[PDB]
């Protein structure tokens, strides 16, 4: 019936940042689904030296890193009485400053690195690119198309970590009604997105998304066009777009405040100087093709730059054929910028991402005069070394409209109508409601993907905004489910 | 094919607690699905005064609030040696008692406020209410009918908050087998159910649930009956059923216990005097109707009061047509009572809700004599200001039976057979197993909603109970999927 | 149309560890689905005596339990200066050693005890076992077949606890962009897997899995074979395979380390001597049969022992008919061993399970004096009594192959291709991707369970491994969806 075969690359020695070519062989009558398999090599950063006290130095992202003298604030000029500074590692072990080869930075991967690895995919027959897509289309259609019963396998395929459940012991935890033992549940991550001293090799399986990769009845015949000209070209992402560093050194500030009660504060600040990650190798580069032994839906994509104030119209130039539905996302440029220290986390998000920061502290309160006992004698406040960060994604688009030749066809729907209500009502089991508030769905059929036969089809797109200005530019990603004909 | 149109209300200036009328216009050939859009205005509470020490006052829900003198317990009569009382805000900042306009209460919304806003919905043609439902039917059919891939969009539509994931830094966390870096996962909420000083305006999208709102093939024609008489009447909930207060003042008790070791306890108690929330405005009241350009299933509902001991029978008077399946829920009256301080959380639950309370405390232990060193010198125990509350829902019904004209047809199934096994086996993808243990499903067809054609159809309902008495009365909500005929 | 009837057992007084027989009566024309209902009685452990100081004793799983003298380490020989040992219960209350009937162990159930209760199920007609399965097949097909919208009802049916959400009060939690109130979310368990002093009676509903229990169109007729010979035989699990103990006594070590600063450590160690759990009773043993009033797919299973190095081949002897797909799992023997203290948790897992252990400690730092103030005067470090345990499951099989008569048909796919990609691409809504990395799916049809008609069918199974040796043996569980014919 069918069999999976491995194909080696036609290029030879693929590298991060360059192109990669596969040639489809002559094995079966049909072939429908293809998957790419790569293994990214192990990663670590270089050894660095601990600084002397009262030293400075330029760090990551154009930010000053400083190790102040005793008796001063975080800046080395302004005095702060009773301040002592030491050096720790990210887990609290001392460092003894001035030591050469003292510490090492930690390394981690981007979120969903298998979706970021294939930066551009195109399919050629004597030139003549029959289909072509990028990674923004992949991240936009994951949020609508992958069901949720398939999500934990997809995260294993693209190299995204999953949280693991753990339990504590029993507790007392009384019941009030207007006693019973009870157990806490905790969650913990361990994968490639967790900063480690050494990352293990990472196996990535990337599903190819063409029109014949979807169904078995739309598989192209192997002898209808010869095997000597069918190629698949993939432009890969660079190493700097895949791996990132975490600071391996922290400055610990202990401060005594005299008085009643005497307070003792402990705070932490990262010392982040960028090192050199070793160059990642690519081994076991393979393409698994499912050969079969015995109209079409072309995903049409377009990305456009936007920098105007308060409202914008863009005409859809590349869209040609009749369209059943489309997915629209406005992604800020700063989400994929190298000046963003949260590019590793926000590259696939379609809104403005802010960060809530919780700094949990331990507090203690000791009294010993034995006779005063109104106010205590000593207070202790100790912070954790790194805080807890919560990403909050806010939508960019306030109102949206999609206009035809002359008529309006949508008169300024609010963005929650297209982000929440249209995926809730339309689609059935094939479309889920996304967690991202910036991903929107526009429908033109009453049953978009519950069935395979067109139930309706079909050019400006206009929107209002508060975010976009001259420096806060954005990109508009449009992925439309068109209909074409193959012969 | 189809187009969404907005309809303004026929009433003019809608208010919370009153009725609201929409008139269906003459635009298309058919219309099937409708959604109501409202925006609830911003909310805050009034400024209040800090009390003097030793003062009392009647608080929230008929409960005494007291600020005791130094040297006494929480009651102002019984003496407790070494007790000092101060006033803090909910985040630990001092208040300086006697100050006028010192603090302000916090405000929040009920759980799922979009489901509670439409208290009653009916559909009129020259009078003659063709369909009518309430909010208990909506909360009962959400727990069975909304799939789960659609749940995070539905919560955005009805104004229910979602938790946001955050991560910490790396940790040590050794491995035992019979070392590796690791990261904690935390969750945090931010929405309208979180108590804040100022609630932002809340946009609500409420889907209307009639028989023609379900399918496109059952859309009623626009010219078959004229547009001059079709009305939709909605009775809205009041403001006191939507917003609630959280105490903005706490009394902090610091207690020194002399001895070996000397202990220092810090506890907290809320000072909760109700204020005046400003009156909520309703703007942008709209009805979005999907007009189409070119037998039935009527949900039949009934609610009945119940107050008998140990067992009860109720005859189903309103049920007329043949019934494919039904959903049954016994909801206690105290879940929707105004004397319940947890009405904001328990109004949509179909069981007895108790509260587990965890009070997490920080403990510290200091020894200094340097020569005794067996037992410490000082202990510190500091509580958090507000505890962690876990709602536990317990079922009311022990055994259930549904009897026909003369025969029994169900002979005392235990309630877990109808709450868990019947939604697990029957329904397919259209029915999920609910988290609420008081929501039960009775089937009469072998395939209830996998298909659209009747596979079986069809009156007392009897049950055993331990909860229901004279003062712990309850309501029986029945939502049945009947079959009628439209012409 | 249909009606559920209860059938009492034919055995009389069933016990844990023995067999149980049901006889199918003569009530309807057809019958398709059956469910078994049992109630396991209440559980507690015996009263034990607190040991004297300096005493030892052989504890649980061949491990020495010791209560050391003051001034020594955990071993009673090596000296440790400034160590004091006391006895606490699991919640921190003192015990006063030497007391007779001082404490009691805690009891809990295995994970998914309803899946472990039916250790073997077979269906007899005059002898002649038409179908037969074990509990490993049930745990293997739960991970693929139960959807996820049905999972919380299934966990209520088989007696597995669910976590309950709770919230804290509001917090400060400033926002950084490159202030707003916020609430924490916590989770907590309360069910039969939580160690308690007294376990309540546990009601178990176990669905029977035969070919006629799946569909209504494949229901066997009641008069086609007589009611006098159809039997269902169930071998039940023993009590030692169902309930387990948790230690009710801990040794608390308080240690003073003199110096600058003076440190005070508090650690805990369990004193675990096994007691006698009372014998569990079985009441309300019933079989609910759905009688109907007016080709086949036989699950073919095989388990084989394996102990070879680095690679293995096993021939599939029992597999006869054409096979649409199969599920394969390699489960270590130590997962079901009685020498494993984590048998209660790992019996249903198909990999090597290691344990990460987090020991959260409270730390405090006090400085009196007032003139030195560089380094503190006293440090406090207090542990929790029991730590937080995270199970990590690692796969045993590295590469897998399934060979036909002469040809290879699979040439060493890596195990993530069969654990993740094949459930992701094939199956549709009927197959989900499992969380267990050792459960693998092999397909032979292009649409395994999206439809009911065979879309392809069909013997060695070989694999590479790093885990399996002479003492780390394993079992191979194969559950295949064959096709047979009934007449």
């Amino acid at each position: 019936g069918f069999e999976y075969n491995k194909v080696r690359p036609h290029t030879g020695t693929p590298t991060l940042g360059n192109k990669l070519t596969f040639g489809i062989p002559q094995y079966g009558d049909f072939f429908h689904d293809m998957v790419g398999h790569h293994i990214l090599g192990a990663c670590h950063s270089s050894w660095q030296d601990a600084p002397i006290q009262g030293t400075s130095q330029m760090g990551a992202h154009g930010q000053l890193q400083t190790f102040p003298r005793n008796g001063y604030d975080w800046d080395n000029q302004t005095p702060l009485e009773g301040a002592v500074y030491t050096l720790v590692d990210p887990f609290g072990r001392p460092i003894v400053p001035g030591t050469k080869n003292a510490y090492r930075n930690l390394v981690y991967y981007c979120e969903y690195p298998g979706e970021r690895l294939y930066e551009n995919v195109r399919f050629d027959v004597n030139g003549n690119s029959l289909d072509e897509y990028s990674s923004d289309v992949t991240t936009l259609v994951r949020k609508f198309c992958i069901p949720g019963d398939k999500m934990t396998g997809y995260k294993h395929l693209v190299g995204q970590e999953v949280s693991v459940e753990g339990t504590s012991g029993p507790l007392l935890c009384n019941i009030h009604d207007l006693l019973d033992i009870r157990r806490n549940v905790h969650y913990s991550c361990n994968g490639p997105q967790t900063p480690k001293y050494y990352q293990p090799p990472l196996a990535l399986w990337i599903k190819l998304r063409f029109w014949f990769n979807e169904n078995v009845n739309l598989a192209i015949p192997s002898v209808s066009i010869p095997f000597g000209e069918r190629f698949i070209t993939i432009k890969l992402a660079s190493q700097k777009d895949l791996v990132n560093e975490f600071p391996g050194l922290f400055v610990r500030q202990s401060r005594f405040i005299a008085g009643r009660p005497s307070r003792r504060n402990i705070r932490f600040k990262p010392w982040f100087i960028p090192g050199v990650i070793n160059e990642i190798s690519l081994t076991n580069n393979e393409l698994y093709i499912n050969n079969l032994f015995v109209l079409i839906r072309v995903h049409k994509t377009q990305v456009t730059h936007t920098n105007n104030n308060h409202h914008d119209e863009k005409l859809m130039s590349a869209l040609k054929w009749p369209i059943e539905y489309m997915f629209i996302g406005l992604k800020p440029t700063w989400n994929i910028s190298d000046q963003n220290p949260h590019q590793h986390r926000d590259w696939h998000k379609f809104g403005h991402v802010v960060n809530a920061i919780m700094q949990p502290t331990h507090h203690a309160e000791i009294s010993f005069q034995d006779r005063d006992t109104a106010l205590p004698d000593a207070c202790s406040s100790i912070s954790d070394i790194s805080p807890v960060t919560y990403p909050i994604t806010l939508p960019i688009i306030k109102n949206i409209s999609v206009t035809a030749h002359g008529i309006n066809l949508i008169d300024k729907f609010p963005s929650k109508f297209c982000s929440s209500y249209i995926p809730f009502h339309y689609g059935g089991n094939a479309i889920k409601t996304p967690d991202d508030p910036g991903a929107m769905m526009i429908t033109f059929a009453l049953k978009p993907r519950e069935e395979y036969q067109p139930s309706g089809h079909i050019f400006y797109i206009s929107w209002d905004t508060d975010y976009v200005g001259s420096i806060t530019t954005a990109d508009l990603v449009v992925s439309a489910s068109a209909i074409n004909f193959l012969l």
Side-chain angles (χ1 to χ4, degrees), chain A:
Chain A
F2 62 97
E3 180 172 56
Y4 274 93
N5 286 237
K6 314 179 194 179
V7 179
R8 303 306 192 277
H10 197 204
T11 307
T13 73
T15 344
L16 286 182
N18 309 335
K19 283 187 181 155
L20 173 73
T21 307
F22 290 102
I24 308 169
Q26 182 71 40
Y27 200 95
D29 305 302
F30 298 95
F31 47 90
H32 86 283
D33 79 90
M34 308 160 160
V35 92
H37 178 238
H38 306 276
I39 291 175
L40 305 193
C43 288
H44 55 88
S45 141
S46 57
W47 288 99
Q48 296 182 359
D49 306 332
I52 359 251
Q53 198 151 355
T55 295
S56 256
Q57 184 153 342
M58 258 320 271
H61 300 124
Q63 302 205 337
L64 189 75
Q65 319 290 325
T66 180
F67 185 20
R69 296 160 289 158
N70 284 5
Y72 293 88
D73 209 273
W74 284 118
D75 43 39
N76 220 359
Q77 289 84 18
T78 270
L80 183 75
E81 177 70 11
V84 182
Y85 297 93
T86 44
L87 296 181
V88 290
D89 87 303
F91 314 113
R93 315 174 288 200
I95 287 300
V96 187
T99 306
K100 293 184 183 294
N101 284 180
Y103 77 106
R104 196 220 294 275
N105 274 340
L106 281 85
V107 290
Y108 59 98
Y109 281 90
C110 285
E111 284 199 346
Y112 301 88
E115 302 196 325
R116 214 184 182 177
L117 181 69
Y118 281 13
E119 201 185 5
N120 196 70
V121 183
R122 56 183 189 250
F123 174 63
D124 290 281
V125 181
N126 294 316
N128 296 119
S129 309
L130 295 175
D131 201 359
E132 179 165 342
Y133 63 96
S134 55
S135 61
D136 288 332
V137 190
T138 296
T139 61
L140 188 54
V141 303
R142 157 178 59 87
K143 303 181 202 284
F144 288 96
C145 293
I146 310 297
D149 274 347
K150 314 283 203 178
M151 204 59 208
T152 183
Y154 183 77
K155 279 178 187 181
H156 285 324
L157 290 174
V158 301
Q160 174 65 48
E161 65 184 1
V162 233
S163 112
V164 166
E165 190 224 353
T167 55
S168 70
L171 318 163
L172 282 174
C173 302
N174 55 81
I175 283 274
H176 290 142
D177 188 311
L178 71 139
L179 290 172
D180 63 322
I181 294 169
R182 184 151 299 245
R183 209 157 59 142
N184 287 125
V185 178
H186 299 107
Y187 296 95
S188 135
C189 277
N190 205 38
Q193 283 78 31
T194 303
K196 293 164 182 176
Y197 283 118
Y198 166 81
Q199 284 285 343
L202 179 57
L204 294 179
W205 303 82
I206 302 99
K207 195 181 190 185
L208 285 194
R209 299 152 150 91
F210 297 118
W211 74 94
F212 54 92
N213 296 136
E214 299 293 326
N215 299 116
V216 287
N217 301 79
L218 312 177
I220 52 176
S222 177
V223 80
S224 176
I225 82 180
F227 73 103
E229 70 238 11
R230 316 173 296 206
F231 285 113
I232 291 177
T233 311
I234 296 153
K235 168 166 192 39
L236 299 171
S238 56
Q239 172 173 308
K240 56 176 208 105
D241 282 81
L242 278 169
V243 289
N244 198 21
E245 280 177 324
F246 190 85
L249 201 66
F250 285 79
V251 188
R252 170 199 217 253
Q253 171 190 68
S254 180
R255 168 149 202 251
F256 182 80
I257 302 108
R260 175 79 184 195
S262 28
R263 308 206 311 277
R264 196 161 190 91
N265 284 318
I266 289 94
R267 300 298 182 256
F268 294 92
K269 194 75 72 73
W271 171 271
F272 196 17
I273 308 298
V276 179
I277 311 171
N278 74 313
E279 188 182 25
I280 311 175
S281 59
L282 277 76
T283 63
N284 283 78
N285 304 274
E286 288 173 352
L287 193 64
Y288 286 68
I289 307 182
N290 190 15
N291 297 281
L292 300 158
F293 302 102
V294 293
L295 187 66
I296 81 175
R297 307 197 181 271
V298 174
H299 300 88
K300 277 189 72 64
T301 78
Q302 139 181 357
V303 181
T304 34
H305 181 261
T306 40
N307 61 93
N308 283 67
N309 239 332
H310 173 252
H311 63 279
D312 207 311
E313 350 54 7
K314 291 262 177 303
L315 97 86
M316 296 299 99
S317 74
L319 282 311
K320 294 181 285 226
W321 282 288
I323 313 229
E324 184 178 48
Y325 61 94
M326 47 194 207
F327 303 130
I328 297 176
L330 203 68
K331 175 182 290 172
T333 305
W334 195 66
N335 279 9
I336 60 177
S337 176
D338 301 356
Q339 298 305 304
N340 196 356
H342 291 303
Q343 185 187 5
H344 70 279
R345 196 191 61 199
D346 301 343
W347 71 271
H348 63 93
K349 300 179 178 177
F350 284 94
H352 181 46
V353 193
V354 306
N355 305 284
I357 285 182
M358 296 206 190
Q359 187 65 260
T361 76
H362 298 250
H363 190 69
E365 196 155 312
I366 295 300
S367 179
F368 38 76
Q369 205 112 67
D370 249 73
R371 70 148 194 118
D372 272 353
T373 69
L375 285 143
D377 271 331
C379 287
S380 107
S381 181
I382 309 182
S383 284
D384 286 280
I385 299 178
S386 21
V388 177
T389 314
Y390 297 92
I392 294 97
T393 304
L394 298 173
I396 308 297
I397 285 177
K398 204 167 60 190
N399 304 275
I400 189 78
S401 292
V402 174
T403 67
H405 293 65
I407 58 172
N408 219 318
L409 183 100
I410 281 179
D411 195 321
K412 292 293 156 210
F413 288 153
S415 56
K416 211 189 271 280
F417 188 81
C418 289
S419 343
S420 291
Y421 180 73
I422 297 296
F424 175 76
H425 186 68
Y426 300 92
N429 285 18
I431 298 283
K432 73 178 182 67
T433 57
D435 294 322
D436 197 90
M440 283 162 299
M441 176 183 177
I442 311 286
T443 195
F444 298 117
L446 292 166
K447 293 174 75 69
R449 222 160 49 190
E450 283 175 69
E451 73 185 49
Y452 175 65
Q453 137 161 312
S455 174
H457 47 269
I458 199 140
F459 197 67
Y460 281 59
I461 291 176
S462 66
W463 57 84
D464 297 337
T465 185
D466 299 46
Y467 170 80
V468 184
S470 16
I471 58 174
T472 65
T473 174
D475 288 351
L476 174 78
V477 178
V478 171
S479 173
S481 177
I483 289 173
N484 206 0
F485 291 95
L486 172 79
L487 185 63

